[PDB]
Amino acid sequence: LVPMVSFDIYSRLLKERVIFLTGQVEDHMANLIVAQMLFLEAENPEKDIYLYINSPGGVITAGMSIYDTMQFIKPDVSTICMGQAASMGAFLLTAGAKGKRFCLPNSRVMIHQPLGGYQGQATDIEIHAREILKVKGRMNELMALHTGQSLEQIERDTERDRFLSAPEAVEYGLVDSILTHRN
Amino acid sequence: LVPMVSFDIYSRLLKERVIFLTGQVEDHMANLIVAQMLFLEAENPEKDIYLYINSPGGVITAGMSIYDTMQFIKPDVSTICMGQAASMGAFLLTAGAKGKRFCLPNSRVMIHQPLGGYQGQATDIEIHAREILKVKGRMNELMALHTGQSLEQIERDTERDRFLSAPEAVEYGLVDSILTHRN
Amino acid sequence: LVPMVIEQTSRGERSFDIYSRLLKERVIFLTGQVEDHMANLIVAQMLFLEAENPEKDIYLYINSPGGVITAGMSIYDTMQFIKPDVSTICMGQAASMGAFLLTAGAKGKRFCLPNSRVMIHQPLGGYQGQATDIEIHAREILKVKGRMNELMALHTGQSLEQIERDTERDRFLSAPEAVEYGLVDSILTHRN
Amino acid sequence: LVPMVIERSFDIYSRLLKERVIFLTGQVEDHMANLIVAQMLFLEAENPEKDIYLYINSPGGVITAGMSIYDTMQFIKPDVSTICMGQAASMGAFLLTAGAKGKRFCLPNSRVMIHQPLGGYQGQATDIEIHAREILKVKGRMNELMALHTGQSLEQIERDTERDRFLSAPEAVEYGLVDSILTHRN
Amino acid sequence: LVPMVSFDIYSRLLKERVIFLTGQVEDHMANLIVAQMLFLEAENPEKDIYLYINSPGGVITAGMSIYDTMQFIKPDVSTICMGQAASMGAFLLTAGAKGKRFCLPNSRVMIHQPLGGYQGQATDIEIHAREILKVKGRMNELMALHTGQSLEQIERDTERDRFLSAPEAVEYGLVDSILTHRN
Amino acid sequence: LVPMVIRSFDIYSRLLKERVIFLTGQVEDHMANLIVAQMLFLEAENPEKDIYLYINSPGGVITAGMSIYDTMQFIKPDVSTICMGQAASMGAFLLTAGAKGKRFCLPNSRVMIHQPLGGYQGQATDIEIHAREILKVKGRMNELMALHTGQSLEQIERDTERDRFLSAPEAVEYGLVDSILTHRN
Amino acid sequence: LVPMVIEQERSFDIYSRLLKERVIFLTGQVEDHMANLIVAQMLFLEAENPEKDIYLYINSPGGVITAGMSIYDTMQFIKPDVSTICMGQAASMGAFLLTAGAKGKRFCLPNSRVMIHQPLGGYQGQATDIEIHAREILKVKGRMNELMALHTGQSLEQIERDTERDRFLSAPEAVEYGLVDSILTHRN
Amino acid sequence: LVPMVSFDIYSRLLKERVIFLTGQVEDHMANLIVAQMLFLEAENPEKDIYLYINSPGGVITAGMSIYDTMQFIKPDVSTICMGQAASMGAFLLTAGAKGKRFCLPNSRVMIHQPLGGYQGQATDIEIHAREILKVKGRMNELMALHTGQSLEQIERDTERDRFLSAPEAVEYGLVDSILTHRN
Amino acid sequence: ALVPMVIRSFDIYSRLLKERVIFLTGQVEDHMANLIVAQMLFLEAENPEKDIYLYINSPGGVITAGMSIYDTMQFIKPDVSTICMGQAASMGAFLLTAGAKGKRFCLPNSRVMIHQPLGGYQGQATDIEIHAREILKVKGRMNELMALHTGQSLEQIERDTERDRFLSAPEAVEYGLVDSILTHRN
Ligand SMILES: *C[C@](*)(O)[C@H](Cc1ccc(O)cc1)NC(=O)[C@H](CC(C)C)NC(=O)OCc1ccccc1
Ligand SMILES: *C[C@](*)(O)[C@H](Cc1ccc(O)cc1)NC(=O)[C@H](CC(C)C)NC(=O)OCc1ccccc1
């Protein structure tokens, strides 16, 4: 039940260089966002891309596919949180082009450390636990980079779930400003 | 089946600036409505959009994606309740352009406070409880803003489910008037 | 099948299951998850032994991964309420509700076996419902968390802030570490 | 159904308990371990001087449940002589080797298997670290005790348990896991 | 459920040194048979024990607990096959004291190699395959000893399921004679 | 569920002093073992005196049934069989396996006979092995049915290719039982 | 849980104890194992005293024909008269075993209800096997009708016609039909 | 679900000689990648193809249909890891044309030996075990070839899961360089 | 589901069909076999003189569904060239070797496996014997046709298929199952 304009409603919006990231982040939905990004860049390598984010979080490697695409392509990707951007969603929100990251007024942001799960031999448990610790550190480094917070601050603040209103997300350095009304 | 007109029935009405919000509010259906609003705003920034609402409620952050787009876009969003607008549905109904919020004569309205659920360590239970109580407070502030009721009245009236007929909804400030017959 | 035992009784021999037999040694086992019914059985055994002789010690062996707090507290309050000292002995593990009842034994009379392990942590819970009810239930679990820290602090001799700090996440303790922490008084190695 | 004996009535297992024989059969877990522990304590109360015979046929099980048995075998006064029939794998091999020195037996066609701990956790990275560190400590303690009972160096036990290792009964003797093969009743 | 003087039909027959092995061979039912053997040996080490076998097969290690107890205890264990002895059942049947192994006239025997199944890394697969092949060889050697067949013949005859009538089982050396009428 | 009489005995235990044994329901290893044990018990108590096996069964597993069949022949006492309700397939086979002159239907029982049913899954080499075996079994059971009924081998096989139902008088005419019990003498 | 009872000493459960007054209960769906328990109690009570009547209380929704016939033939074969008493209901196999009692000794409790009907069955298979199995259930149907006619005193034609669909009878109607002899009301 | 440029987003990028391998490697998804490669070769046999890889691994034989196609066709296949390339994903990454294998900066690579499982008669277990061992050695030989590491180093390093950062994957020889920003 | 579009429009498979290329992927069953048969019949109609390329990546499948493809391959006028990528096992290996003589290929890292039929039946002994006779007839016919295409004797095919038999691509050339290894496009 998706409406049409020959373009479906999202194809139409893709014409105004708008991409939607909605729901849990996972490989296949992430692949769709990456293809839209490479396409938009192909269409006009200089003009901004708008990425709307309404997401409860998701899988780290899937989110890192979108993150590296965002940094790799020529156009600035301007991120706009609507609804919520939690964990992986907060991370991609803050990864937008400096000065071009926005929360809508009543959107809410949440941040936290990695969660994972493994089963098997103690030797293998060691290998996998070291990996998720490595991953937690890189994520914190990147989050510190984009927010302007120190690495130590990000580590403390993400030990447990932390929720932030749109003004709190601005103050934290997570986004640059609230978008309220179309200028 | 969705009938054809070359549009499907909904695409055809989208041409009249008409959008339908039907069913449980959740991220993807919510994103469809946001895309339709953004599409219509692009087609004509000054012409009103009509949002028909028939909903038993739904997810708060999903609903707030719709709310913020309603307030962000240039066109006024006129809201029309058919069937029911309950909880998140009622919130988005009252969020329409002042003077352009309608109930159909036998539609019914229901308002209530958030419901949620979390499992985990006491420390985490406290973090999540804080967040749902904060959201409850903010949603009340916005309900008061739109209906014209005092914050305190709203709090009182939402502790448990409260049902309103179309005439009672007009009286409460939830809607501006009743549409009985077209002109 | 629980093995049984036959024993002279001056009114004839009668049969005792293995656990009934050990009750005559004044021994009670707490094994597995703590939950109302298994907890009630232990309460009942404690009350029985006190009636048999209010002045002789009881031995409570604990091998438990944890369990329900109110069920645990039915055992805790009974251990304090009855006249005899309840000596506690950890075998296998005593985790969470199990560590709590272990440390709750009569002072000087709480023991770990040498290769037992102890784990402590804060409460875990979960509610669903209206925000007003969520607050009510969150407030209750936070009340319980504090009361349980106060009692752990009491029994171990650590400060409340130390117990609070140490139980935010799961913490494991070897037998020597549990002695060093104040959780038990000593290690039992070879039958005294 | 458990056979009864008429004399005044024992099930087969209770009858053999009176001859100081306990059976550890199947996966090791808290409740069946509690039953073995209880039987050991009973036998000690009956006579702290006479040996106990613990027959072991087990594919392994839960480490803490196994350690309740291990520590009881060491704590009680009587020697616990262990006899492997069918198999003793992982926690079953550990309990077999933990028997009184000189009094650990394999039956001729029994087999033994040793390996390191297996586990699984789900949660925050912080919690994953806490749990991994604890499984690694357990792995080390279990290796130290295996070395002690077998006569192998800690290094050799660690190397030989990275992956499953099977031993015939003569191999379990050569390894120091048991003292001798029991073939026929003397 | 069993005929009762707690004291069932099986316990009365135990009084006459008769033990039944019925159904799939598995640790717990095997421990019961072991316990009955040791009991009977303690009662009288000189008198024969009678083991009726009606079994489709089962777990090798469970079976070996019985086998080794049969060899270890002082009394001779006489085996009698009723209905069938397949695989682990045929193995325990032939393991009875030579001269005291019997088929009833219309019982059937079946012999085969081990079946197994593992999942894991190729290194682990290699370890578990090596072990099942070791077990296959040891079991073939013991079958050869008990039947009087060569190792080569047992190997060739067990690569696939091989069925034997009671007279065929006498000819193969798996039992000593047919039991038809009590004298 | 099981009533008892009083030293205490359950109802079936009680009837066991009457030298009466019940075979009820699907024939399978464990219920068949209980019947075997009762037969062996009764022989030991008195090897001269007849045993009465009441049979009401829809059939069952062949090997389980053959444990009973061979025990019936092996023990010293005659086993007299009495069909109540029905004796179908393995039930009919054990009915006709009773001592000659001592096999009975009650007037409204019915007997049904049929060939073996089975099923295998595997490589074609294994399918052939198993199919050979079920056919060997089918033949051996027809040879035993012929022995007990007095019909020829080829005839029993013909009449059992499909399910065949018999009234009590028809079961007598076929040679499956000797007589019909109507009113206790 | 079945209540215990101590007879001045052995413990009988409620049912064991009422067996000493020669009372057996048939309750629920008639099936092989429950029906064997009834057969064994009948054989027990005959062995105790072959002259003395047995009382069989029936409260049953119906059940398997062959299992019912195990009980029917035992009722007829044993020396004692089996008196039947319906409480609650006796439907189909229950109604048949109720009317199978000793003539003059078959009763309904007043608010008993009886129902009668023809066999129901089902099969799946090749057409050849379908015909075999259809012919067998048609034979069983006829034989059950012949027996019902014998016990009720109704003609075989009446029985056949009345059992083509479920037919319900009050206890008064069951007396009038010949299904039971009389209504039992108070203890005399 | 798939944005409609007439063309879907993937068909559109196919025009740019871009193919996505996303998720578990399995016969049908692999056949789709094969078909795209064959098509791009038929379109221009001398121009590179770009294969974006975000995969947790998969079935070996499916992976090898891709591998052999990559080698067989006339164009070079440049591989680009986004998110992760694990096991079969890492193998296909490393099998890209020399000089043309890339990791995005926060992509992660993991290598390990085969996993398999089988159930059946010991004779059959022996056959299937021999086959997985053959496959393991063959895969090591090919990894050694593509990375420049010795066969013994590869064997040692893949007995258990080995994780590599993007710079570590460059050091290891799995890829040639890190891509960061579009030239 | 996702199949890329090429340009009036074509799906990726449709485009490759223009090159006379057909894919047989996964388990052989009636409906996927029917699609392959239809594609062959179409390509014959387009040009009865030009070769057809069948790529095979399959773990095996249903014999009668396989024979619908096999007989199509022999019936049609064009030579059908077969190319194994990934694996061709059992029914896959059979269709691979059924290709036109000299035009059967393995890619270098593909693997082949061959085995006798597997089946299963439940019913009366009379019926078991009918169905057992049928699967044995099928087994012999499939061995005859494998011997024909490989050039091996029928007794060789019978012996070698009694259990799963795996072959590397060079082994599959030595066996006569394919004619050569395709490595780089000419
Ligand atoms: C919860 C949130 O969505 C995080 C993403 C995240 C963003 C930013 C920072 O700094 C850390 C994390 N998502 C996850 O933790 C997912 C959780 C769900 C249940 C899929 N976890 C995940 O992808 O596992 C990562 C992992 C890495 C290495 C080893 C094992 C697991
Ligand atoms: C029930 C109605 O749909 C409400 C939305 C609402 C509107 C206006 C006001 O004042 C309050 C609430 N919906 C919910 O409460 C949903 C019910 C779920 C979908 C069953 N709850 C929800 O979105 O949870 C929000 C939340 C959870 C945890 C922490 C913070 C917020």
Ligand SMILES: *C[C@](*)(O)[C@H](Cc1ccc(O)cc1)NC(=O)[C@H](CC(C)C)NC(=O)OCc1ccccc1
């Ligand atoms: C995990 C351990 O067993 C704890 C017991 C405990 C001991 C000592 C201290 O200081 C704190 C806790 N058990 C629990 O937390 C249980 C785990 C459940 C059974 C999964 N949780 C529990 O009993 O909930 C209590 C509760 C819930 C809601 C509101 C109030 C109390």
Ligand SMILES: *C[C@](*)(O)[C@H](Cc1ccc(O)cc1)NC(=O)[C@H](CC(C)C)NC(=O)OCc1ccccc1
């Ligand atoms: C597999 C075998 O039974 C081992 C026991 C063992 C014996 C001897 C040595 O040296 C090491 C281990 N059992 C386990 O590993 C169990 C297997 C489960 C039941 C599948 N694992 C277990 O008890 O988990 C241990 C654990 C310890 C600390 C933290 C988490 C889990």
Ligand SMILES: *C[C@](*)(O)[C@H](Cc1ccc(O)cc1)NC(=O)[C@H](CC(C)C)NC(=O)OCc1ccccc1
């Ligand atoms: C089919 C038969 O019951 C065999 C027992 C047997 C007897 C005599 C000889 O020579 C060989 C075998 N039982 C098994 O093969 C069991 C079948 C299971 C219960 C389905 N298999 C078994 O116990 O596997 C043991 C094993 C697996 C992997 C590695 C080593 C041992």
Ligand SMILES: *C[C@](*)(O)[C@H](Cc1ccc(O)cc1)NC(=O)[C@H](CC(C)C)NC(=O)OCc1ccccc1
């Ligand atoms: C249907 C009836 O109960 C038969 C028993 C029978 C009695 C007399 C004659 O002459 C033949 C058969 N029972 C079976 O056929 C069972 C039915 C099963 C329980 C569904 N079948 C059976 O035991 O198969 C045994 C078998 C299978 C494969 C190979 C050999 C034997």
Ligand SMILES: *C[C@](*)(O)[C@H](Cc1ccc(O)cc1)NC(=O)[C@H](CC(C)C)NC(=O)OCc1ccccc1
């Ligand atoms: C419904 C009532 O209980 C009848 C018993 C009955 C009594 C008196 C007369 O005259 C006819 C029937 N019970 C049945 O019909 C059972 C029904 C249930 C579902 C078991 N049916 C039954 O036993 O199968 C009948 C049958 C006979 C021969 C062949 C196949 C099936």
Ligand SMILES: *C[C@](*)(O)[C@H](Cc1ccc(O)cc1)NC(=O)[C@H](CC(C)C)NC(=O)OCc1ccccc1
């Ligand atoms: C874990 C990773 O995805 C491997 C692929 C691999 C790549 C490179 C090297 O050097 C080794 C392996 N995938 C597998 O192991 C799959 C895992 C399954 C899908 C869970 N295993 C597989 O395809 O089966 C292996 C096998 C080969 C031959 C015979 C039987 C089984």
Ligand SMILES: *C[C@](*)(O)[C@H](Cc1ccc(O)cc1)NC(=O)[C@H](CC(C)C)NC(=O)OCc1ccccc1
């Ligand atoms: C395992 C392989 O895929 C074989 C195909 C085969 C090819 C070549 C030769 O010489 C023999 C076999 N496939 C089968 O055996 C299928 C496997 C099923 C789908 C699991 N079996 C099959 O089609 O059964 C055929 C059959 C059954 C009963 C009677 C006649 C034929």
